[PDB]
Design an enzyme around this catalytic site. Structure first.
Site, short mmCIF file in Angstrom:
data_model
loop_
_atom_site.label_atom_id
_atom_site.label_comp_id
_atom_site.label_asym_id
_atom_site.label_seq_id
_atom_site.Cartn_x
_atom_site.Cartn_y
_atom_site.Cartn_z
N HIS A 40 -5.91 1.97 1.96
CA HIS A 40 -5.62 2.13 3.37
C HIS A 40 -4.25 2.74 3.71
CE1 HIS A 40 -4.34 -2.11 2.68
NE2 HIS A 40 -3.43 -1.87 3.61
N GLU A 71 -10.36 -0.75 -3.11
CA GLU A 71 -9.20 -0.77 -2.19
C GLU A 71 -7.90 -0.43 -2.89
OE1 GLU A 71 -9.85 -0.63 0.86
OE2 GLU A 71 -7.77 -0.70 1.57
N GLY A 145 2.85 -5.70 6.63
CA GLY A 145 4.09 -5.22 6.00
C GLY A 145 4.14 -5.66 4.55
N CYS A 147 1.46 -5.14 2.50
CA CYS A 147 0.54 -4.35 1.75
C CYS A 147 1.25 -3.50 0.72
CB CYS A 147 -0.37 -3.49 2.63
SG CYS A 147 -1.64 -4.60 3.35
C1 D03 Z 1 -1.55 -4.35 5.15
O1 D03 Z 1 -2.27 -3.12 5.34
C2 D03 Z 1 -0.16 -4.18 5.72
O2 D03 Z 1 0.68 -5.06 5.56
N1 D03 Z 1 0.09 -3.10 6.36
C3 D03 Z 1 1.30 -2.63 7.04
C4 D03 Z 1 1.33 -2.94 8.55
C5 D03 Z 1 2.57 -3.08 9.20
C6 D03 Z 1 2.65 -3.36 10.57
C7 D03 Z 1 1.49 -3.49 11.34
C8 D03 Z 1 0.24 -3.34 10.71
C9 D03 Z 1 0.17 -3.08 9.33
C10 D03 Z 1 -2.31 -5.50 5.84
C11 D03 Z 1 -1.96 -6.90 5.32
C12 D03 Z 1 -2.69 -8.00 6.06
C13 D03 Z 1 -2.50 -8.01 7.59
C14 D03 Z 1 -2.51 -9.48 8.02
N2 D03 Z 1 -2.18 -10.13 6.75
C15 D03 Z 1 -2.18 -9.36 5.66
O3 D03 Z 1 -1.81 -9.65 4.52
N3 D03 Z 1 -3.73 -5.23 5.54
C16 D03 Z 1 -4.59 -4.85 6.49
O4 D03 Z 1 -4.29 -4.72 7.68
C17 D03 Z 1 -6.00 -4.57 6.04
C18 D03 Z 1 -6.23 -3.07 6.27
C19 D03 Z 1 -7.45 -2.44 5.61
C20 D03 Z 1 -8.07 -2.96 4.46
C21 D03 Z 1 -9.18 -2.29 3.91
C22 D03 Z 1 -9.67 -1.12 4.50
C23 D03 Z 1 -9.05 -0.60 5.64
C24 D03 Z 1 -7.94 -1.26 6.18
N4 D03 Z 1 -7.03 -5.27 6.81
C25 D03 Z 1 -7.25 -6.60 6.69
O5 D03 Z 1 -6.58 -7.30 5.93
C26 D03 Z 1 -8.36 -7.15 7.53
C27 D03 Z 1 -8.81 -8.42 7.38
C28 D03 Z 1 -9.93 -9.04 8.16
C29 D03 Z 1 -10.26 -10.38 7.87
C30 D03 Z 1 -11.29 -11.04 8.56
C31 D03 Z 1 -12.01 -10.37 9.54
C32 D03 Z 1 -11.70 -9.04 9.85
C33 D03 Z 1 -10.67 -8.38 9.16
#
Ligand code: D03
Length: 180
Positions: A40, A71, A145, A147
């Site tokens: 992602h 992923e 943040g 990831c």
């Molecule tokens: C990381 O992508 C992350 O930390 N990203 C940087 C960021 C900074 C500021 C704002 C937004 C993002 C993120 C980590 C998660 C977020 C909450 N807790 C965590 O550890 N990961 C995601 O956002 C991922 C994104 C993704 C994964 C796979 C394909 C496409 C996108 N999404 C999720 O973790 C979604 C989870 C979820 C769970 C249950 C029901 C629906 C969704």
């Protein structure tokens, strides 16, 4: 104790902060010019690595033998320096441990380490609408943040943090055979 010492040294030698158009992530260099990010992160033909523009020669979004998402994206970087080779720290299959450390290296979480406790083979997860396999789970409330965070135990690089639901975090298992 040992795992934190291991994590700190691993991060110093092999990790960096990357910015793509989709955000800022921790990046782990694996060997030669091949690194890994969460899928992602969606790296384009150029990324910012520690603020410097670096070309992406090749990018491979990993799937299993059915086409199921893992992923992880593998990235070949256009640069002189080679990563210290850390393939011997990657298992052949999913590792479960009683104590793990999750390491983050961004502008937001610079040099932060989190003791996440038990890591279990979760296997299948519908991760933001996508069926995903080889997930490792820990019951820490990871947040945005984190990831690309690197999941470790003493002498082992277990996986890369790719998601969370607000209560549990998930890492994609980083397996040796992805880097043959
Ligand atoms: C990381 O992508 C992350 O930390 N990203 C940087 C960021 C900074 C500021 C704002 C937004 C993002 C993120 C980590 C998660 C977020 C909450 N807790 C965590 O550890 N990961 C995601 O956002 C991922 C994104 C993704 C994964 C796979 C394909 C496409 C996108 N999404 C999720 O973790 C979604 C989870 C979820 C769970 C249950 C029901 C629906 C969704």
């Amino acid at each position: 104790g040992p795992a934190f010492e291991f994590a700190v040294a691993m991060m110093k030698r092999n990790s960096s902060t990357v910015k793509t158009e989709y955000g800022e992530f921790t990046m782990l260099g694996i060997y030669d010019r091949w690194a890994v990010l969460p899928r992602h992160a969606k790296p384009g033909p150029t990324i910012l690595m520690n603020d410097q523009e670096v070309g992406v020669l090749d990018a491979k979004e990993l799937v299993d033998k059915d086409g199921t998402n893992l992923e992880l994206t593998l990235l070949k970087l256009n640069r002189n320096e080679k990563f210290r080779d850390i393939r011997g720290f990657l298992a052949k299959e999913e590792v479960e441990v009683n104590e793990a450390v999750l390491a983050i290296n961004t502008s937001k979480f610079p040099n932060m380490y989190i003791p996440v406790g038990q890591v279990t083979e979760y296997g299948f997860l519908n991760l933001g609408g996508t069926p995903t396999k080889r997930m490792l789970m820990y019951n820490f409330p990871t947040r945005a943040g984190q990831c690309g965070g690197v999941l470790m135990s003493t002498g082992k690089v277990l996986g890369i943090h790719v998601g969370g639901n607000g209560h549990q975090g998930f890492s994609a298992a980083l397996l040796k055979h992805y880097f043959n």
